[PDB]
From Swiss-Prot:
Record gene name: PNO1
Upper classification of the organism: Eukaryota, Fungi, Dikarya, Ascomycota, Pezizomycotina
Assembly mode: Component of the small ribosomal subunit, ribosomal RNA processing complex (SSU RRP complex).
UniProt organism field: Chaetomium thermophilum (strain DSM 1495 / CBS 144.50 / IMI 039719)
Domain KH: 96-148
Residue intervals passing through the bilayer: none
Biological function: Required for small ribosomal subunit (SSU) synthesis. Has a role in the processing of early nucleolar and late cytoplasmic pre-RNA species.
Name of this protein: Pre-rRNA-processing protein PNO1
Record carries keyword S-adenosyl-L-methionine: no
Entry's localization field: Cytoplasm; Nucleus, Nucleolus
Keywords assigned by UniProt, alphabetized: Cytoplasm, Nucleus, Ribosome biogenesis, RNA-binding
Amino acid sequence: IETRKIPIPPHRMSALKANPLVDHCKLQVRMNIKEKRVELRSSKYTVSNEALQMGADFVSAFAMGFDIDDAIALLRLDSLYIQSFDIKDVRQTLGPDALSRAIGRIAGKDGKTKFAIENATKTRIVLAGSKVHILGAFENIGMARESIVSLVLGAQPGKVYNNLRIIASRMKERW
RNA sequence: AGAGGAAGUAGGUCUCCGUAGGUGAACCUGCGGAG
C-alpha cells in the first residue's frame, strides 16, 4: 500500500473541481485545492504500480496545462509521454530580449504556428511563457522539440514548417 | 498653295489575476501584469 500526493498550480483549480479516477483505476482520491494538494491512495482493488504512476502522471499532466480531452489520452495509451521544455534551456544569445520575441515566434498570432506544428507532427503542446509542454509519442516530441528550438535559433517559421512536414511524412512511412 | 518626274528608307497562443465599460451573479470587450 502506497500513496502519492501531487501539488497543483492555482490556475486549474475550477477545472479540477470539475468531475472519476476511482472508477478509472479503482484508486481512492482526495483533493484540497487550498493546500494545493491531491491525494492518491492505493486500495485493495488497486493492483499495480503502473496504475499508481500512471494516475500520478495523468493528474500532473492535467495540472500543467492540458485538459481532460488530452489527459484521458494519457490515461488510456501507454505509449504517450509528456516532456516539459523550458525556453531558458539551450540559448543562442545572452541578450534578455528572449521571452516576448521567442514565444511570439513559437505561438504565432491566433495560434497559427503552434497549431500548424501540432497538426503537422501529431503532438499536442501548450505554451505558457518560459515553460512549453509537449504531449505525444516521444519521436513526435523530438520532432516538435527540434522545430521549436530551430524557431528560437531564429529560423523562419515557413522553412521550419516545411522541413517539419517532410520529416513527419518520412516518420509516418513504414518502409 | 499643285497634278507629274526622279530617289531612299521600312508574428504573444492558452490560463489566471488587477482594472475600466457593457445588462446584471456569472459573462463579453479593451488594457496592464504574472505564469
